[PDB]
Design a binder for this molecule. Structure first.
Ligand SMILES: NC(=O)C1=CN([C@@H]2O[C@H](COP(=O)(O)OP(=O)(O)OC[C@H]3O[C@@H](n4cnc5c(N)ncnc54)[C@H](OP(=O)(O)O)[C@@H]3O)[C@@H](O)[C@H]2O)C=CC1
Ligand SMILES: CCc1nc(N)nc(N)c1C#CCc1cc(OC)cc(-c2ccc3c(c2)OCO3)c1
Length: 189
């Protein structure tokens, strides 16, 4: 299964959150998030999403786990166990892949502690970074930042991104309030 990292970051500091939660609510970006992590090319198969313990708690308690997707929560306290059909607790990402079978794609959906560690892993080959632009980056309060070495990564064209998402609509320069974001694909050099 292909392991990929999906994230929304504000240029150029690559910020993601403030005081434990996201400092922006983009309606079309959430729709993009729901479509890519669910869509499958192979018959009778489903995609998996790996998240941190703090992200799982921040996600609405009545709207968890995420429907149509295999929810995997990383925790050093919990053992490699299967609770139900959708929720699986694992210590590492290498152990979670061996435990589950018949999975097409694997997505990494948060958070900061997970992003910074899994970027330097051989399993991850693709990045679905949503680069957000703002006229005044200093105005938005931020304390959480991404530590990615994008110099070792190659930015793929829009045609390569379209193949990865399928028939998902990709709009250029999506303006919501003051924010302007674009979907980009990244592969290892
Ligand atoms: N815009 C975006 O694309 C998104 C932004 N975010 C932002 O990121 C922030 C969340 O990041 P953060 O606070 O770091 O929370 P995380 O989701 O990264 O979870 C951290 C917790 O997960 C556990 N953990 C971390 N690494 C491992 C590991 N390697 N093995 C086992 N367990 C591990 C630890 O708990 P334990 O010791 O119990 O195991 C730790 O306390 C939020 O503020 C949010 O705003 C998050 C998702 C998306
Ligand atoms: C959807 C935001 C997002 N975008 C991208 N590009 N990558 C990501 N990893 C994420 C994310 C995330 C975790 C998260 C945290 C959260 O608490 C603040 C709420 C949501 C969330 C936000 C909107 C939702 C939803 C979940 O279910 C469907 O509608 C989702």
């Amino acid at each position: 299964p292909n392991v990929a990292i999906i994230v929304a970051a504000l240029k150029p500091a690559l910020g993601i959150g403030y005081k434990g939660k996201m400092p922006w609510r983009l309606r079309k970006e959430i729709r993009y998030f729901k479509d890519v992590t669910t869509r499958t090319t192979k018959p009778n198969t489903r995609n998996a999403v790996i998240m941190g313990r703090k992200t799982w708690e921040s996600i609405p308690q009545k709207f968890r786990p995420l429907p149509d997707r295999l929810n995997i929560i990383l925790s050093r306290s919990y053992e490699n166990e299967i609770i139900d059909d959708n929720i699986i607790h694992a210590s590492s990402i290498e152990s979670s892949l061996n435990l589950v079978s018949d999975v097409e794609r694997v997505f990494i959906i948060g958070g900061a502690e997970i992003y910074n560690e899994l970027i330097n892993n051989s399993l991850v080959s693709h990045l679905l970074i949503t680069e957000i632009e703002h006229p005044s980056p200093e105005s938005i309060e931020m304390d959480t930042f991404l530590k990615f070495p994008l110099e070792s990564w190659t930015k793929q064209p829009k045609s390569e991104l379209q193949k990865f998402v399928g028939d998902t609509v990709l709009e250029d320069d999506i303006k919501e309030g003051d924010f302007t974001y674009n979907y980009t694909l990244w592969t290892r050099k």
